[PDB]
Design an enzyme around this catalytic site. Structure first.
Site, PDB file in Angstrom:
ATOM      1  N   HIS A   1       0.668  -9.335   4.480  1.00 30.15           N
ATOM      2  CA  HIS A   1      -0.327  -8.468   4.447  1.00 30.15           C
ATOM      3  C   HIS A   1      -0.838  -8.700   3.095  1.00 30.15           C
ATOM      4  CE1 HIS A   1      -2.325  -4.886   6.472  1.00 30.15           C
ATOM      5  NE2 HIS A   1      -3.059  -4.898   5.287  1.00 30.15           N
TER       6      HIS A   1
ATOM      7  N   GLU B   1      -5.525  -2.110  14.027  1.00 30.98           N
ATOM      8  CA  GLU B   1      -6.044  -1.005  12.849  1.00 30.98           C
ATOM      9  C   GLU B   1      -7.420  -0.359  13.450  1.00 30.98           C
ATOM     10  OE1 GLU B   1      -6.510  -2.240   8.915  1.00 30.98           O
ATOM     11  OE2 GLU B   1      -4.441  -3.222   8.616  1.00 30.98           O
TER      12      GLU B   1
ATOM     13  N   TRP C   1      -5.216   3.403  11.774  1.00 29.67           N
ATOM     14  CA  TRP C   1      -4.929   3.242  10.248  1.00 29.67           C
ATOM     15  C   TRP C   1      -5.449   4.509   9.584  1.00 29.67           C
ATOM     16  CZ3 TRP C   1      -2.530  -0.502   7.471  1.00 29.67           C
ATOM     17  CH2 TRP C   1      -2.687  -0.317   5.948  1.00 29.67           C
TER      18      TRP C   1
ATOM     19  N   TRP D   1      -6.508  -0.957  -1.886  1.00 33.89           N
ATOM     20  CA  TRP D   1      -6.797  -1.981  -2.638  1.00 33.89           C
ATOM     21  C   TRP D   1      -7.621  -1.792  -3.710  1.00 33.89           C
ATOM     22  CZ3 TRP D   1      -3.065  -4.809  -1.351  1.00 33.89           C
ATOM     23  CH2 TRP D   1      -2.626  -4.891   0.003  1.00 33.89           C
TER      24      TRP D   1
ATOM     25  N   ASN E   1      -2.281 -10.757   8.593  1.00 32.97           N
ATOM     26  CA  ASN E   1      -3.203  -9.589   8.540  1.00 32.97           C
ATOM     27  C   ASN E   1      -4.623 -10.235   7.965  1.00 32.97           C
ATOM     28  OD1 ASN E   1      -4.252  -6.656   9.024  1.00 32.97           O
ATOM     29  ND2 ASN E   1      -4.708  -7.045   6.814  1.00 32.97           N
ATOM     30  N   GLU E   2      -5.669 -10.188   8.694  1.00 30.92           N
ATOM     31  CA  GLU E   2      -7.115 -10.032   8.148  1.00 30.92           C
ATOM     32  C   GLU E   2      -7.254 -11.464   7.236  1.00 30.92           C
ATOM     33  OE1 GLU E   2      -8.374  -6.503   6.865  1.00 30.92           O
ATOM     34  OE2 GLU E   2      -8.550  -5.471   8.836  1.00 30.92           O
TER      35      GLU E   2
ATOM     36  N   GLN F   1       0.761  -1.304   0.068  1.00 30.76           N
ATOM     37  CA  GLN F   1      -0.050  -0.069   0.094  1.00 30.76           C
ATOM     38  C   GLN F   1       0.791   1.073  -0.092  1.00 30.76           C
ATOM     39  OE1 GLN F   1      -3.048  -1.766   3.176  1.00 30.76           O
ATOM     40  NE2 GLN F   1      -4.150  -0.150   2.104  1.00 30.76           N
TER      41      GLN F   1
HETATM   42 NA    NA Z   1       3.936  -0.458  -3.528  1.00 32.10          NA
END
Ligand code: NA
Ligand code: NA
Ligand code: NA
Ligand code: NA
Ligand code: NA
Length: 444
Positions: A118, A351, A398, A406, A162-163, A18
């Site tokens: 992640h 988060e 977060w 995403w 993560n998640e 991200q």
């Molecule tokens: Na990147």
């Protein structure tokens, strides 16, 4: 005298794909998200993380920025395609980035919390079947063990996944996330292989017996309300709750998938991957649980189909995601964990945050008063949980900065810091200044 003790960690969180950019530098090969974002229609306006916030090159400035905010802990993820760009092929240049990143953090009195996975699975792994191929348990274990051995002197707080709800159901059943399949049986098997990989890393971790080091997992959790007191809506809520929350809480902390969900899913797909040996590996003791919390759901019975609860809009304020701002569920979820799953185990909010329509005004400032009020309300519930005996150890906002959200691309801005992507300029939003005051006074 302090609402948050000196030892309580005020943090911020990011994820590698991200923010990092430098997607083809220093040996990095494609992840499933590089691939997915180049498939037509999958990501908003074909945005991708080629450049993102360019945090790979700008990390020293970003660490200085966190130091000046007084950030005490930084949650980030490590990019598997940087560490193993090809199967069995270790890339020391990729490891070097995380050593200099974490060296910078420690030298600025920021505690690193590393997320091992992640969502940026290497494309080479997905070409071998990805999370559908049980061999991934060994590939992931090899990756994790390399991180533990190379970075164990740098990082003392590790998060396996993560998640996993997103990596399984959102990626293989709903198809919003990479690789974008739409098959309930696949998503169910992926959820199991993710949890089994989690268990492999915990097994490896315990065998290292690293000094003063902790391992946990991060789960996105909500609270589900029935739209009415009817039995129809109560079953709908129960199914929605088992789908989001119990499908992961139960194997991890009870050593058993939730039997109502096993029977419900079994009407539509195979659930034969369940076995005692796997559940024993899955449910190994953790040092902490990471909670990602954003919103609640109010649900009403749909039309008897597969997971077709109708989403009710209760009429309250919402973020740009469409997510209701309901801070009380942060308290309710932490209390539910304390009374039903984790008991006295340390908890972290790994988060919490919000996307609002942020604009740099003529004065060069970002007056994101809605985000200030959002975070203020949620930290007040964290304080309430602590004052009622909850074992909350820290809270990661977060996100540190606006980033690649995403399937939404760069169109959703979660940062306490604004990123002007054309210049890569960082601008502290009013929420970052508020957070700075909170860390300094530890008063809310
Ligand atoms: Na990147
Ligand atoms: Na693209
Ligand atoms: Na545990
Ligand atoms: Na712990
Ligand atoms: Na509330």
């Amino acid at each position: 005298m302090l609402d948050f003790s000196k030892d309580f960690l005020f943090g911020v969180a990011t994820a590698s794909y991200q923010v990092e950019g430098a997607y083809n530098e220093d040996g990095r090969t494609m992840s499933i998200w590089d691939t997915f974002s180049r498939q037509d229609g999958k990501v908003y306006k074909s945005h991708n993380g080629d450049v993102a916030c360019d945090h790979y090159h700008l990390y020293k400035d970003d660490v200085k920025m966190m130091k000046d905010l007084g950030i005490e802990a930084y949650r980030f993820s490590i990019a598997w395609p940087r560490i193993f760009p090809a199967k069995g092929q270790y890339n020391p240049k990729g490891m070097d980035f995380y050593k200099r990143l974490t060296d910078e953090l420690l030298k600025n009195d920021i505690k690193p919390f590393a997320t091992i996975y992640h969502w940026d699975l290497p494309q080479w792994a997905d070409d071998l079947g990805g999370w559908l191929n049980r061999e991934i348990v060994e590939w992931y274990g090899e990756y994790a063990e390399k991180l533990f051995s190379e970075l164990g002197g740098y990082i003392k707080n590790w998060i396996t996944l993560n998640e996993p709800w997103c990596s399984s159901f959102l990626s293989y059943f709903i198809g919003e996330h990479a690789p974008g399949h739409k098959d309930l049986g696949e998503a169910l098997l992926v959820s199991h292989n993710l949890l089994l990989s989690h268990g492999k890393a915990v097994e490896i971790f315990r065998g290292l017996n690293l000094d003063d080091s902790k391992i946990g997992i991060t789960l996105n959790l909500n609270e589900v309300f029935p739209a009415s007191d009817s039995d129809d809506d109560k079953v709908a809520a129960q199914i929605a709750d088992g789908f989001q929350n119990r499908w992961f809480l139960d194997p991890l902390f009870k050593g058993k998938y939730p039997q109502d969900m096993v029977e419900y899913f079994g009407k539509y797909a195979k659930v034969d991957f369940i076995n005692d040996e796997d559940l024993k590996l899955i449910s190994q003791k953790l040092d902490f649980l990471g909670v990602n919390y954003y919103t609640r759901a109010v649900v009403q019975k749909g039309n008897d189909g597969l997971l077709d609860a109708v989403q009710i809009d209760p009429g309250n304020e919402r973020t740009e995601m469409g997510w209701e701002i309901y801070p009380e569920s942060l308290y309710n979820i932490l209390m539910r964990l304390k009374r039903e799953y984790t008991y006295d185990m340390p908890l972290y909010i790994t988060e919490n945050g919000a996307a609002f329509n942020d604009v740099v005004e003529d004065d060069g400032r970002v007056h994101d008063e809605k985000r200030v009020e959002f975070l203020k309300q949620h930290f007040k519930e964290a304080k309430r949980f602590l004052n009622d005996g909850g074992n909350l150890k820290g809270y990661f906002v977060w996100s540190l900065m606006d980033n690649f959200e995403w399937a939404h691309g760069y169109s959703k801005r979660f940062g306490i810091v604004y990123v002007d992507y054309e210049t890569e300029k960082r601008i502290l939003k009013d929420s970052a200044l508020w957070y700075k005051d909170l860390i300094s006074t530890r008063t809310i």
